[PDB]
Specification:
Chains A, B: One of its GO terms (molecular function) is 10-hydroxy-9-(phosphonooxy)octadecanoate phosphatase activity. 2 copies of one chain form a homodimer. With 546 residues, chain A is an alpha/beta fold. Chain A is built from 24 helices and 15 strands. Bound molecules: 4-chloro-2-isoxazol-5-yl-phenol (ONR) (2 copies). One 4-chloro-2-isoxazol-5-yl-phenol binds next to loops of chain B.
């Protein structure tokens, strides 16, 4: 039975292949057929290319050796190479044009998800060209999804030499009959087959994947649309900043480019952005996903006043100061969405652009107490329940697994009607003791939240709701202002607490506001509809945040 | 007696002042004298500018109000404003032209170093212009050096209103007679003086600083060249990455821009780069200063093989992978300098550019054992002493304070002659028990190294020297290669271990190599000559690493 799947890079996981570009160049320059592919393989096991693929020489050292072989070949063929002939230019273009074969990677992702050990086995080079970063990026994106990456130039062996196949088997810790090996080169497939491995000659991806699903017994073609890449907490870079004597802020960091600061809601974690973090880093951004004050590995002081918007915002500015960041784009959801609008109003110079998921911007009413305003809408009753210190803490801390399984549900699986919470005497009074697992979350993801909330519980998080009068007084200072920096409001059709209609008057205070809207989406936006959140945020970031 | 110094921003810590640009614009456009400065202050305490300075409105809301005042003023003066007249353009240019008044900041730095509480008190605005980042950067650079930053738009009060002075006093926790207040506006100086504060009217900086040194009794003018800004460990962003099950790498992170990975030597710390970190972040780079494997907060496994160059380099590649970085510029010193040359040889696609302080690149000799090679030079005797497990550990761990005070010395203060270390029976056998403090380090800096080395001691660090045969075999695989990515070699005249002449043949293997050379510099390059290290690295980074 098969338990390992091995994929080649060129012509398998990345398309189009370099081999195909040499043939394409021959046709474009009207050179004799096979001239370039012949000069490329010249000398066979003793040639310039084998030395390159084994790591004896770098790509920049190889370029003039390929040039001499091209001259040698054209001379024999009794043809002249064009006066403008450049191997450097041909290969720069070829490497740059090569993209990830998305359905092939998807199949590799599915096999690994089903228990297969996966690896990339590739005949590659040590790239020292001025434009080497493009390839470095491609390799980074691909390698994360595999258990192993075996590169010829790193191991000093090449396909089709028998030793590299014995090396692969040793790294996989598998017998040959347990391995599927996919290659676009028949000669490189031959030693794997001779060893007893299942082999697939990759021409077109569809046929190769049909062969792959037939032999594995796993559906790989015509499959439902997969979720975006998630985060393994133990594989992330974890950052810590002391913003003041008793306050440290924890964050997860991924990627390079403009700083994008992700701010979660209640009662969440940096992990609520698990599907956004890899996608935003891949899109060309440096992601900083916070554990907001009171949560996870961030400090959780007991005082109510430690959680007023004025102090929370001041600390986020100090956080940027200590990291040496003059700005960041601030993206928030629920309570984080509220923080993010206040960062834009009070610290516009530090906010590159601002985006909110579900949380609308509604200016403070100076002629009404926030407590009066909250009583006016039956949807905000849960906020009154959260007022009395200790009451909501006891219900939320009683059974953590039940707390997160009851809360984290899609619009069609709700177990909590958020009205008459005070009258009913709690959030979960009409909710089961052992809720079923929502289609949005796995048991393991629920257990990550349970483990995080064991440190500080719900006091700090609930204190975010206990500064209504303080926040109202502070917000009233901003009443003559408008938000004029780039801004995005993302509404969720089925969020019955932060309803899309609550955002209807926002253009009065944010004239240049851009919008996003997600159909069939509940309150837990990021995990309910990750693919669509990613598409909206990436499109807005590339157009408005650089 | 004075214990607090307060500085204005415009016309004091930043030059030229905005007030001066309005007068300059009047002259350039041949407008009536004072027309623009009059439209700017129009309405006085009830005008558009006061509302802006109090934070009622943002800068972008203020621009059209200033335009209307300019029209109102020109109408009364019976003059016409040019057809191309733009307040947005005038202010963008003014804000952009304004730079830190370096001798004023230097004086503030000196007063704080001598025990003064320092603060910036400024009449400023909430900047929401598309080009707001320039000002955000200026403020970031300035604010770090002060105990307090009081901004009119944040406190809702302005100079010359009496309340802001009472507010300043309350934040300083000082009586008026204990405060020096420096301002370029006579009217804004008046309430501080009326309160009993010492006041300085700032016209030209030299005269203001003469007045300031006379009144404080501290030398501020004609002072020796100051050292670059250092790091307070508790104020840095601390990052942690698990590169494999039992190995976590710790780093300090500062700044935005291309990733610059700093790799220390033996027996050091991320803190050895304390003078480079703020300077490189200020220069426009994202600094990642490592605790190399075996050091500080990074994991220190006991096995010798965990510290061979092949594994150390593999882990640094994984470190980039987990951070989502396709590349970084790698800068190393001593052992870090060696690591960095091997990163360039084995992983050029991941290395944006490479720089080494003191450590030359010398290819492995395939016809000689590394032990033979080390015996040939009397300067490398200390490496033979480091071979036997436990011997060097006992001497180095015996008295940590003595270890670091004996090692960390300038070329003219050496207490260690590194020859006949084996014959003498140790590094410190002819060294005092209580060495004097070198002019390079403070007692507190020595104690930071003592605290770091208390966790794992010297086993992991010494193991870097215990993989000679392993490293030689690995390096021999790279003998046909050349380093063709951007590279810098920095030599130190007085490093008697890593002598500048050892680097003489480097151009044979690195043809495009760039060089830096530091006179009167010992082995501890970064702390011996920080200003010159910063100048060389910043110039090379801006030209060769983007
Ligand atoms: O918006 C919310 C805010 C707080 C809490 Cl505890 C729950 C929700 C919510 C909306 C839908 N299901 O839970
Ligand atoms: O280069 C060195 C390497 C190791 C050790 Cl322990 C000391 C030095 C050194 C050079 C000058 N003073 O110490």
């Amino acid at each position: 039975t098969l338990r390992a799947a091995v994929f080649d890079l060129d012509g398998v996981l990345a398309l189009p292949a370099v081999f195909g570009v040499l043939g394409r160049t021959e046709e474009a320059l009207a050179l004799p057929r096979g001239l370039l592919n012949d000069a490329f393989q010249k000398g066979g096991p003793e040639g310039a290319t084998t030395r390159l693929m084994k790591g004896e020489i770098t790509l920049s050292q190889w370029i003039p050796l390929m040039e001499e072989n091209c001259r040698k070949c054209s001379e024999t063929a009794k043809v002249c190479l064009p006066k403008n002939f450049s191997i450097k230019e041909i290969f720069d273009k070829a490497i740059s044009a090569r993209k990830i074969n998305r359905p092939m990677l998807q199949a590799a992702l599915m096999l690994r998800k089903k228990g297969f050990t996966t690896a990339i086995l590739t005949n590659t080079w040590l790239d020292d060209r001025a434009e080497r970063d493009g390839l470095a990026q491609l390799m980074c994106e691909l390698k994360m999804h595999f258990d192993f990456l075996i590169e010829s130039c790193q191991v000093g062996m090449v396909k089709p030499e028998p030793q590299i196949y014995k090396f692969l088997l040793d790294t996989l810790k598998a017998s040959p009959s347990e391995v599927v090996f996919l290659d676009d080169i028949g000669a490189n497939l031959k030693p794997a087959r001779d060893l007893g491995m299942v082999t697939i000659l990759v021409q077109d991806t569809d046929t190769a994947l049909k062969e792959l699903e037939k032999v594995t017994g796993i559906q790989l073609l015509n499959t439902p649309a997969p979720l975006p890449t998630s985060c393994n907490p133990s594989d992330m870079s974890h950052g810590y900043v002391t913003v003041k004597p008793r306050v440290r802020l924890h964050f997860v960091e991924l990627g390079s480019g403009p700083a994008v600061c992700l701010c979660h809601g209640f009662p969440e974690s940096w992990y609520s952005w698990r599907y956004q973090i890899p996608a935003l880093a891949q899109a060309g951004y440096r992601v900083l996903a916070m554990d907001m004050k009171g949560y996870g590995e961030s400090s959780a002081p007991p005082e109510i006043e430690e959680y007023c918007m004025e102090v929370l915002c001041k600390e986020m500015v100090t956080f940027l100061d200590k990291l040496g960041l003059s700005q960041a784009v601030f993206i928030g959801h629920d309570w984080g969405g509220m923080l993010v609008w206040y960062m834009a109003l009070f610290y516009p110079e530090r906010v590159r652009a601002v985006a909110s998921l579900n949380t609308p911007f509604i200016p403070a009413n100076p002629n009404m107490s926030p407590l009066e305003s909250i009583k006016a809408n039956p949807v905000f009753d849960y906020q009154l329940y959260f007022q009395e210190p200790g009451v909501a803490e006891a219900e939320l801390e009683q059974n953590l697994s039940r707390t997160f399984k009851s809360l984290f549900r899609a619009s069609d699986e709700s177990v909590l009607s958020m009205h008459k919470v005070c009258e009913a005497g709690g959030l979960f009074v009409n909710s089961p003791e052992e809720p079923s697992l929502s289609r949005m979350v796995t048991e393991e993801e629920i257990q990550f939240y349970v483990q995080q909330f064991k440190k500080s519980g719900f006091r700090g998080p609930l204190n975010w709701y206990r500064n209504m009068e303080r926040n109202w007084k502070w917000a009233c200072k901003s009443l003559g202002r408008k938000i004029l920096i780039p801004a995005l409001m993302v509404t969720a059709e089925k969020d019955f607490v932060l309803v899309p209609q609550m955002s209807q008057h926002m253009e009065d205070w944010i004239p240049h506001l851009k919008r996003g809207h997600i159909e069939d989406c509940g309150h837990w936006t990021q995990m309910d509809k990750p693919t669509e959140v990613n598409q909206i945020l990436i499109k807005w970031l590339d157009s408005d945040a650089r």
